Amino acid sequence: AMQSTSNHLWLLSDILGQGATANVFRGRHKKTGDLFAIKVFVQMREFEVLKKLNHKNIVKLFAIEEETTTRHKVLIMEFCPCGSLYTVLEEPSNAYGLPESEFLIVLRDVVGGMNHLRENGIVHRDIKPGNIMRVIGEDGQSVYKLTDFGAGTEEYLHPDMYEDLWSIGVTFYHAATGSLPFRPFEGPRRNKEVMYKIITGKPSGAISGVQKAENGPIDWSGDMPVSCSLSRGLQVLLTPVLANILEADQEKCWGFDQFFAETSDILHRMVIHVFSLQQMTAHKIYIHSYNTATIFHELVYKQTKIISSNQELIYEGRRLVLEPGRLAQHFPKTTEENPIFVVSREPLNTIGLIYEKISLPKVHPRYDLDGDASMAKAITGVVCYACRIASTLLLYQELMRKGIRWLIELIKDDYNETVHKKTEVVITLDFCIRNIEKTVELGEISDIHTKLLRLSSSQGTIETSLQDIDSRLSPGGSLADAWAHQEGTHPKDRNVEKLQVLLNCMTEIYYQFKKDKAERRLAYNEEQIHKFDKQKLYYHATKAMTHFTDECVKKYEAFLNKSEEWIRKMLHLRKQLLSLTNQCFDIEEEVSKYQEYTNELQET
Numbered sequence: 001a002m003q004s005t006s007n008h009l010w011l012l013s014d015i016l017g018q019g020a021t022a023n024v025f026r027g028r029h030k031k032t033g034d035l036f037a038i039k040v041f042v043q044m045r046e047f048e049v050l051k052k053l054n055h056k057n058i059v060k061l062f063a064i065e066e067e068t069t070t071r072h073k074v075l076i077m078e079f080c081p082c083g084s085l086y087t088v089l090e091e092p093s094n095a096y097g098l099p100e101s102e103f104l105i106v107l108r109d110v111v112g113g114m115n116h117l118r119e120n121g122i123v124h125r126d127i128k129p130g131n132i133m134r135v136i137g138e139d140g141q142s143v144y145k146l147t148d149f150g151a152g153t154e155e156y157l158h159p160d161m162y163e164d165l166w167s168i169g170v171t172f173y174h175a176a177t178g179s180l181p182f183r184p185f186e187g188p189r190r191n192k193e194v195m196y197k198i199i200t201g202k203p204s205g206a207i208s209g210v211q212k213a214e215n216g217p218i219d220w221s222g223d224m225p226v227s228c229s230l231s232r233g234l235q236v237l238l239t240p241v242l243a244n245i246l247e248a249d250q251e252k253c254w255g256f257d258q259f260f261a262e263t264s265d266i267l268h269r270m271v272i273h274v275f276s277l278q279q280m281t282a283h284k285i286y287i288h289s290y291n292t293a294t295i296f297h298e299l300v301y302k303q304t305k306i307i308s309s310n311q312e313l314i315y316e317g318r319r320l321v322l323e324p325g326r327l328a329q330h331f332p333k334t335t336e337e338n339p340i341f342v343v344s345r346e347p348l349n350t351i352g353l354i355y356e357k358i359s360l361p362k363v364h365p366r367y368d369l370d371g372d373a374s375m376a377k378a379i380t381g382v383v384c385y386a387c388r389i390a391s392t393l394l395l396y397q398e399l400m401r402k403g404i405r406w407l408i409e410l411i412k413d414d415y416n417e418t419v420h421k422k423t424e425v426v427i428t429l430d431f432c433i434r435n436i437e438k439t440v441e442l443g444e445i446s447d448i449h450t451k452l453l454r455l456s457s458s459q460g461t462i463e464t465s466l467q468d469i470d471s472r473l474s475p476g477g478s479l480a481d482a483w484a485h486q487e488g489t490h491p492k493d494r495n496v497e498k499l500q501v502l503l504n505c506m507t508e509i510y511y512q513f514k515k516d517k518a519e520r521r522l523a524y525n526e527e528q529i530h531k532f533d534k535q536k537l538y539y540h541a542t543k544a545m546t547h548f549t550d551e552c553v554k555k556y557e558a559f560l561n562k563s564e565e566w567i568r569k570m571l572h573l574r575k576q577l578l579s580l581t582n583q584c585f586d587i588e589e590e591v592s593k594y595q596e597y598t599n600e601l602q603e604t
């Protein structure tokens with residue numbers, strides 16, 4: 001049994017969305033077989049004007065047909081097989097926030113879609129992840145579209161409307177943190193009056209309000225949580241956009257013009273990957289392609305507290321000198337695995353990666369299809385977070401080994417250049433101390449040897465202290481990079497994939513529990529499978545957290561503690577080589593005052 005039309009037909013089992021106004025079914029065309037989104041319920045004019053609406057970020061309304069049996073007005077819309085943004089946020093990998101690249105696609109499509117709607121004059125009123133569909137483009141990247149804006153949601157209401165830019169800020173915060181900005185204790189249900197009190201609290205600059213106790217306080221915050229998977233450079237640019245659109249004051253509201261301007265400023269910026277080798281921290285500098293490198297060093301300082309003049313950059317095993325006027329679009333292309341390492345002559349504190357330390361929530365023995373579903377979603381997102389941090393800690397160590405293996409070669413290049421200037425002084429020394437011996441009232445000569453022999457003696461002390469550094473930069477010379485290969489974790493251990501095996505098992509049990517919740521009750525046979533796999537869900541999470549802390553974190557903190565000591569020894573050797581090289585330049589000019597002095601007397 002199923003309904004049909006003159007051109008389309010759909011099964012009632014293939015139901016997609018179910019709302020108050022109508023329901024949307026997954027249907028096909030009677031002549032082509034292509035899949036369409038069939039929506040089964042003044043109109044003839046406001047619907048044909050939605051047909052001409054053609055935009056990348058808007059679901060195309062193809063045609064309007066009338067059903068056969070009930071003669072109901074049926075809308076033939078574009079089918080989006082990936083679901084809505086809410087479906088994307090339900091996956092455990094996005095439980096603590098979307099990927100940073102995926103987050104930029106959402107912001108670009110949402111802004112690009114509403115801007116086209118404002119050019120035509122359509123107010124969306126309700127903008128939630130349920131109103132934003134996802135389509136895979138021809139290139140493989142996601143494409144987000146708007147669809148439902150005709151005649152919103154309890155969690156995405158303005159305080160004055162609770163009794164346009166508001167729901168957009170809640171959606172972006174939800175997509176960036178994986179959670180809602182204003183959450184009471186028992187959720188926005190019976191604590192609905194608390195939800196209204198949270199919004200009317202209007203802390204202006206703050207964007208979050210977590211009630212971690214029943215009828216307790218409201219923990220405000222103006223910054224993104226630590227679990228946010230976005231880069232620190234993106235949070236600095238995203239925070240003021242949300243804070244200025246999350247307050248009831250129309251006097252202090254931004255409006256679409258200032259919103260579209262500042263959002264376009266973020267999307268027009270390219271990414272420059274920079275890894276602080278002395279702090280063991282990876283960063284992402286969001287800089288426009290037309291800015292100079294001076295502004296680039298400014299953004300590196302605002303994210304690493306490194307002075308611009310002290311920023312010494314390394315790229316692909318060689319030093320990198322950035323001209324203060326060199327545009328950002330002419331910088332070398334960088335990735336997360338091949339960034340621009342920044343080192344400074346000043347001593348820097350070794351911090352490492354900062355992440356939220358979360359534990360496993362206890363599993364309840366109550367057989368509750370809704371309880372086990374909400375429990376499986378939270379515990380699987382925790383493993384995704386631990387699997388995310390594990391891969392980040394592995395990347396930090398692998399980036400650390402390359403940066404250290406490069407820096408020792410850059411130091412050996414500075415040592416070899418000192419040898420070049422040493423041979424220039426030794427040749428000048430010998431060809432001037434012996435050219436006097438050939439020619440040899442004598443105090444004009446004896447004072448030279450008492451000064452030339454002091455130069456050859458102090459120059460020799462540089463040679464002894466240089467070959468010592470050559471012995472320190474040798475394998476096993478109290479500065480070798482061999483410890484980095486024999487301390488932390490490696491891709492050979494395959495720790496990220498060992499956690500990802502247990503993650504897929506927990507996700508399949510979660511997806512099965514997600515299906516078990518749709519079914520109101522299970523049979524006796526399926527009930528025990530739901531209980532047996534529920535216990536396996538705990539053993540998989542316990543096995544992963546044990547392997548995460550007792551292997552990934554222990555080896556990381558052992559590698560980090562070893563790195564903090566090697567940085568001091570490296571900073572100590574750089575100060576000696578710099579002094580020894582400076583002791584070769586000042587004596588290079590001290591032998592210049594004597595090579596022309598007595599060697600060239602005056603006589604007709």
Ligand SMILES: CN(C)CCCc1ccc2oc3nc(N)c(C(=O)O)cc3c(=O)c2c1
Binds near residue numbers: 037078080082084087
């Ligand atoms: C990857 N798997 C988990 C997909 C999840 C289920 C699904 C699939 C396709 C869909 O395609 C839609 N296409 C539309 N045009 C509209 C609308 O316009 O409201 C709504 C939907 C869905 O909800 C939907 C859900």
